[PDB]
């Protein structure tokens, strides 16, 4: 979808997620992948869920790149 919309969706949802002060969602927002808002709530829910397999209570950059590459394809 629209880059601007995409960014709005990422920021609105991660807004009540606790992310490390260095994560930057633009790295994903700027990717040339057409994805839905479902896909984004998805990467976002997966990221917080994986806050737990290495098990850190704050969401990190790595939680995202994972969620993202799994969810999109």
């Amino acid at each position: 979808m629209d880059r601007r919309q995409k960014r709005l969706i990422f920021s609105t949802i991660t807004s009540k997620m606790n992310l490390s002060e260095e994560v930057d969602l633009e790295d994903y927002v700027a990717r040339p992948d057409k994805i839905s808002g479902a896909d984004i709530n998805s990467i976002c829910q997966e990221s917080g869920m994986l806050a737990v397999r290495e098990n850190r209570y704050i969401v990190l950059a790595k939680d995202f790149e994972k969620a993202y590459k799994t969810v999109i394809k």
Partner: protein, 229 residues
């Protein structure tokens, strides 16, 4: 808290400086062990903004340029997070301004994206390349223009960043500013040399991308510049 499998990194992230000092001075090798993500106490203190723990680790002389397993250097982490004082202590100790991580980003990509002006300047003054391209051939200016960070676009142009680099979708920063309706950014860019002619991969120039009010304004500006200058 508890972000790492190594307890000294959790102390660094937690801000427990006194405990961290006692353990490391008992066995200095501990200050540079890497954890499961290849981070050390320095990465985690930067990630949490504990300037004082960063100063203690730099006082001990630990490496300031090692990357974690996603290719993030302590300078990347501090620059994206917005630690001005940490960024500054890192640079004084030799942090590599053009280091790249696994997305191909330099710390300036993150400073620009997140509107960290003072850090972008420290970086550019320290020699960062304004034109570094990430893995999608996007520069700091693509980030800043897309997001509407006008003053960040002013700072980049001041350090001579190019305005016509194309990402892998063939977009220049001007296409991105047009696409997201960043009116003042788009105008500033055309006034500084962005071309209203370059086509992206979908065969569109920034004008074909822009809403009509903006496209007319950019057109006008472009003919202004092509007439004088």
């Amino acid at each position: 808290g508890c972000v790492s499998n190594i307890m000294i990194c959790n102390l660094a992230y937690s801000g427990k400086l006194d405990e961290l000092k006692e353990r490391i001075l008992a066995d200095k090798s501990l200050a540079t062990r890497t954890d499961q993500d290849s981070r050390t106490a320095l990465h985690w203190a930067c990630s949490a903004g504990h300037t004082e723990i960063v100063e203690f680790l730099l006082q001990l002389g630990v490496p300031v340029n090692d990357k974690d397993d996603a290719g993030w250097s302590p300078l990347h982490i501090a620059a994206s997070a917005g630690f001005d004082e940490i960024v500054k202590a890192l640079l004084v100790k030799g942090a590599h301004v053009n280091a790249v991580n696994q997305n191909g980003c330099t710390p300036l990509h993150y400073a620009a994206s997140k509107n960290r002006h003072e850090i972008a300047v420290m970086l550019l003054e320290g020699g960062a390349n304004p034109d570094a391209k990430d893995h999608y051939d996007a520069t700091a200016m693509h980030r800043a223009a897309a997001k509407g960070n006008l003053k960040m676009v002013h700072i980049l142009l001041f350090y001579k960043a190019s305005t016509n680099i194309q990402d892998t979708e063939g977009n220049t920063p001007l296409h991105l500013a047009c696409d997201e309706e960043r009116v003042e950014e788009a105008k500033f860019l055309v006034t500084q040399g962005a071309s209203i002619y370059i086509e992206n991969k979908e065969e569109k120039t920034p004008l074909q991308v822009a809403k009509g009010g903006l496209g007319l304004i950019l057109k006008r500006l472009a003919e202004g510049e092509e007439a004088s200058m």
